[PDB]
């Protein structure tokens, strides 16, 4: 029952989203003032990474629970669980970020309120921030429903092509169930057209590269 697979993906996503959609949208009005901006800009490059590293660690814990509730994930062998979360958790965080992005004025939700890329100057990788803003922007352009994003993020996480799986047959099968769930849910509702506008897979991996490995220094 593929429909059960959908229903679970959707339910867990609802349960693990970490920030509800209605509060992200209600909070689009609370925008950081120039003094709050400055305030973040004057932090040290250490402090700012400590800070965002915490948040990224928290968000990662939610994705872990998303898979923990994913029907057929816990079936998988412990090794494969770890490989898939290691290689995909961060990619899913970044896709989940597009909910908290507002394309009307190019701001993101960060620590209670909304602001632009200027907020993150103290990280010192303005190129990378501009890229994270771009990517969210073109992702928000799909106007995904909650159900779409749930199924999407599940495929981001269940990819049998990840270097280092033991039971590569068992993941292909889950990946393949999800593909059919997703493609069929899209076609049933005439949303098929969004498949063309999905980011190319390299783009995600690119974006989730070295700048975010080795963050134990910040713990
Ligand atoms: C630059 C470091 N970094 C990243 O590089 C990825 C690819 C994980 C995406 O952006 C991030 C977001 C976050 N955060 C939250 C979380 F947990 F949802 F990820 S966060 O600190 O709240 C945050 C939100 C939005 C932006 C644009 C940035 C730079 C940070 C932390 C680190 C990163």
Author numbering: 269 to 487
List passages from the publication reporting this PDB structure:
Retinoid-related orphan receptor gamma (RORγ) is a transcription factor belonging to a sub-family of nuclear receptors that includes two closely related members RORα and RORβ. The nuclear hormone receptor RORγ regulates transcriptional genes involved in the production of the pro-inflammatory interleukin IL-17 which has been linked to autoimmune diseases such as rheumatoid arthritis, multiple sclerosis and inflammatory bowel disease. This transcriptional activity of RORγ is modulated through a protein-protein interaction involving the activation function 2 (AF2) helix on the ligand binding domain of RORγ and a conserved LXXLL helix motif on coactivator proteins. The conformation of the AF2 helix can be modulated through targeted ligands which bind the LBS and increase the binding of the coactivator protein (agonists) or disrupt binding (inverse agonists) thereby enhancing or inhibiting transcription.
However, extensive crystallization efforts with BIO399 and RORγ518 or other AF2 intact constructs did not produce crystals. We attributed the inability to form crystals to the unfolding of the AF2 helix induced by BIO399. We reasoned that if we could remove the unfolded AF2 helix using proteolysis we could produce a binary complex more amenable to crystallization. The Actinase E treated RORγ518 BIO399 ternary complex (aeRORγ493/4) co-crystallized readily in several PEG based conditions. The structure of aeRORγ493/4 BIO399 complex was solved to 2.3 Å and adopted a similar core fold to the BIO592 agonist crystal structure. BIO399 binds to the ligand binding site of RORγ adopting a collapsed conformation as seen with BIO592 where the two compounds superimpose with an RMSD of 0.72 Å. The majority of the side chains within 4 Å of BIO399 and BIO592 adopt similar rotomer conformations with the exceptions of Met358 and His479. The change in rotomer conformation of Met358 between the agonist and inverse agonist structures is attributed to the gem-dimethyl group on the larger 7 membered benzoxazinone ring system of BIO399. The comparison of the two structures shows that the agonist conformation observed in the BIO592 structure would be perturbed by BIO399 pushing Met358 into Phe506 of the AF2 helix indicating that Met358 is a trigger for inducing inverse agonism in RORγ. BIO399 neither orients the sidechain of Trp317 toward Tyr502 nor forms a hydrogen bond with His479 suggesting its mode of action is distinct from linear inverse agonists.
